[PDB]
Amino acid sequence: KIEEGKLVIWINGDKGYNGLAEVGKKFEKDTGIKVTVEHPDKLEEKFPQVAATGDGPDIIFWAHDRFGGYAQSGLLAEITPAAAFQDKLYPFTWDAVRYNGKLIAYPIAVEALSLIYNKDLLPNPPKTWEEIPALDKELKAKGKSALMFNLQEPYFTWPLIAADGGYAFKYAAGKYDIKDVGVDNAGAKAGLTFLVDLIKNKHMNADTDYSIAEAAFNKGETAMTINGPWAWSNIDTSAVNYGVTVLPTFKGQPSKPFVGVLSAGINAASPNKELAKEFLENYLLTDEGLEAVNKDKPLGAVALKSYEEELAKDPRIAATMENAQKGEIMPNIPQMSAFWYAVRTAVINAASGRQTVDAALAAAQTNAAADPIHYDKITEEINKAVDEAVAAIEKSETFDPMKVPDHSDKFERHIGIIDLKGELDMRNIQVRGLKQMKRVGDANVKSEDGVVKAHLLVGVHDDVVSMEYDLAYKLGDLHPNTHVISDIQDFVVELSLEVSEEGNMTLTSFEVRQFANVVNHIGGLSILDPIFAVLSDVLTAIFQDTVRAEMTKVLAPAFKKELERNNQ
Numbered sequence: 001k002i003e004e005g006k007l008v009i010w011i012n013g014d015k016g017y018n019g020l021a022e023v024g025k026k027f028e029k030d031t032g033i034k035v036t037v038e039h040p041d042k043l044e045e046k047f048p049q050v051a052a053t054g055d056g057p058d059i060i061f062w063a064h065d066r067f068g069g070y071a072q073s074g075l076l077a078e079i080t081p082a083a084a085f086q087d088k089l090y091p092f093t094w095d096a097v098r099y100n101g102k103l104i105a106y107p108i109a110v111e112a113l114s115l116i117y118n119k120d121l122l123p124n125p126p127k128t129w130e131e132i133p134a135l136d137k138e139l140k141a142k143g144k145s146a147l148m149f150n151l152q153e154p155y156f157t158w159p160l161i162a163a164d165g166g167y168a169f170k171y172a173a174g175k176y177d178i179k180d181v182g183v184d185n186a187g188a189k190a191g192l193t194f195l196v197d198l199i200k201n202k203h204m205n206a207d208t209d210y211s212i213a214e215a216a217f218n219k220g221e222t223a224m225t226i227n228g229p230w231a232w233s234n235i236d237t238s239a240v241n242y243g244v245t246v247l248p249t250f251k252g253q254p255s256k257p258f259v260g261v262l263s264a265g266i267n268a269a270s271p272n273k274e275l276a277k278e279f280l281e282n283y284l285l286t287d288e289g290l291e292a293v294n295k296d297k298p299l300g301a302v303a304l305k306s307y308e309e310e311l312a313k314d315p316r317i318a319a320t321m322e323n324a325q326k327g328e329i330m331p332n333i334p335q336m337s338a339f340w341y342a343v344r345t346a347v348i349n350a351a352s353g354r355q356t357v358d359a360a361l362a363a364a365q366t367n368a369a370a371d372p373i374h375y376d377k378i379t380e381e382i383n384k385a386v387d388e389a390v391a392a393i394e395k396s397e398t399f400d401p402m403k404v405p406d407h408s409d410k411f412e413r414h415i416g417i418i419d420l421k422g423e424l425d426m427r428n429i430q431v432r433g434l435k436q437m438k439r440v441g442d443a444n445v446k447s448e449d450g451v452v453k454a455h456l457l458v459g460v461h462d463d464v465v466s467m468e469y470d471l472a473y474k475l476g477d478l479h480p481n482t483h484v485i486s487d488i489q490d491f492v493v494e495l496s497l498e499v500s501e502e503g504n505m506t507l508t509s510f511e512v513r514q515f516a517n518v519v520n521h522i523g524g525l526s527i528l529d530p531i532f533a534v535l536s537d538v539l540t541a542i543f544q545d546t547v548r549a550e551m552t553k554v555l556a557p558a559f560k561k562e563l564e565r566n567n568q
């Protein structure tokens with residue numbers, strides 16, 4: 001229950017919430033009304049969840065791109081600033097928060113990504129993304145790195161993906177055609193493929209996230225990084241001598257980062273809409289107000305004419321403005337969340353190798369047009385389901401060691417002056433190592449007609465699934481009996497789940513992907529023994545058919561009974 005007479009405010013953890021708190025103290029020193037600032041995790045989703053239950057904070061902070069959907073849901077109260085107040089803020093920043101002709105929030109400051117380099121390590125930073133692989137070679141020779149930026153959020157990679165032609169929604173005659181997406185076009189594949197080549201060529205790691213990139217850069221390890229104004233504070237207090245400049249160009253074209261406007265919205269179910277207006281219009285959106293917040297963490301180009309004008313003489317801000325001009329201001333429509341999840345998923349999978357650049361973006365083209373949902377929420381949820389299910393399997397002993405029915409097969413190959421005939425049969429077949437199969441990566445979710453579909457991967461990586469067994473084959477007059485051990489590398493399972501509106505999780509599909517490779521160790525026989533090649537080829541073949549199948553038929557049931565136990 002939103003407490004009346006008090007002000008609860010939410011802002012992102014990477015912003016100057018400590019400074020925002022001080023402004024909250026002054027408000028309390030003048031009105032007696034306490035202001036509490038909190039920076040929850042996943043607030044861009046937490047808010048719409050609690051605010052939908054008629055609860056939440058009185059004021060929520062975030063880039064305008066999210067607010068479109070918030071307002072659509074009726075979670076945001078229409079702001080009421082006098083024409084005189086609007087006048088003291090740049091018009092374009094009001095357009096940013098205008099949804100359906102109504103102003104649904106107060107703009108705070110414009111923010112754009114810029115290139116951040118180490119003056120000492122790199123006095124003159126590269127002007128293009130292409131001359132970066134070369135620069136990495138040099139730095140590596142000195143135990144350094146060329147570039148490190150968050151690859152877990154599509155917000156940071158998008159600048160490159162759009163550079164050559166990528167785009168979210170086609171804007172036409174004052175309207176964003178939610179059907180005309182542009183993430184898998186020629187211009188987009190070029191960018192993502194480039195980004196992927198950087199990882200394939202080990203110039204950067206896919207696992208790299210915000211904190212890892214920040215630590216390396218501020219530690220002096222990497223020469224460059226890509227971040228926003230908020231990031232400057234931590235670099236200031238580091239030892240790194242830094243500069244902020246124009247992002248690298250791609251194919252003679254500038255990187256087009258999505259520009260966002262940090263906005264403050266008032267929760268519709270708030271009983272303190274007047275106290276909220278006071279705070280925002282007369283305590284935060286003042287030169288003294290924005291300064292307190294800015295000292296803690298730079299806001300970028302504030303929407304307040306007076307202050308934006310004062311800090312406009314900052315080289316770093318001058319850079320940010322340059323990047324903003326080259327890129328475009330994000331649309332605020334509700335479909336924006338889908339767009340983000342789609343791209344976020346395409347980038348992550350393409351960078352991890354889970355999907356090829358084409359497969360990823362094609363799926364993003366589709367997903368960006370699906371029914372927006374609390375992705376994170378549902379993802380963590382489904383992962384949790386599979387995990388516990390897989391952990392249950394780990395308990396049973398029926399699958400590890402997994403007994404496998406014998407098998408016999410006849411073959412032949414015209415080897416010389418003989419249509420070489422001969423067969424062999426396997427006994428005491430046992431699969432091992434399936435007790436260590438975890439979930440690889442997040443569940444890739446999508447919602448259609450109210451039903452959620454999820455695709456996952458369960459496998460035994462950084463380990464091996466061996467199948468030991470007694471073998472016997474016929475070679476002319478030789479009837480040898482030995483023991484074999486076939487190792488399978490990269491054992492993977494493709495899962496397909498479906499969560500009904502009733503909340504029922506039913507297994508859609510289950511298949512053991514064909515083994516990337518199989519290394520047969522035939523006892524007493526050497527890889528140099530001419531026969532090995534034939535036997536190995538046969539064993540591996542019946543492995544990719546018989547074994548792999550009678551392995552799926554045994555794991556499919558166990559995965560159904562679990563993913564559908566508590567089901568109902």
Ligand SMILES: OC[C@H]1O[C@H](O[C@H]2[C@H](O)[C@@H](O)[C@@H](O)O[C@@H]2CO)[C@H](O)[C@@H](O)[C@@H]1O
Binds near residue numbers: 012014044111154340
């Ligand atoms: O990565 C997708 C994400 O991008 C934007 O979020 C930014 C935000 O604008 C910045 O102020 C800062 O907090 O970094 C965020 C990236 O993690 C969009 O505003 C957001 O909706 C979107 O999910």
Ligand code: NA
Binds near residue numbers: 016017018
């Ligand atoms: Na802080």
